[PDB]
Amino acid sequence: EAERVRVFHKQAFEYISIALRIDEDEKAGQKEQAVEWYKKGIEELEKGIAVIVTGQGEQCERARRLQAKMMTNLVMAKDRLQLL
């Protein structure tokens, strides 16, 4: 339900953020580090998107909105990881 979504969302956001920072840094030789952070972030995204959110109401709706943004990001993250 919403509480679990919030935890996975925040953890995924932090792991994907550090992976992106490393991947964006033009210096060479650090893609292997980015890969490991992307894998951690993808795991959190997958779990968070799959959390069952039941019923209506504001907190359920907010959680589902986070899950939709997580889903867009998951597709992108898996697509990036295949290239590294």
Partner: peptide
Amino acid sequence: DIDFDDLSRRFEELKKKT
């Protein structure tokens, strides 16, 4: 306010450099 959509845009920018 940085959210996941902002991170998705960062992936798009990386992809355009591939």
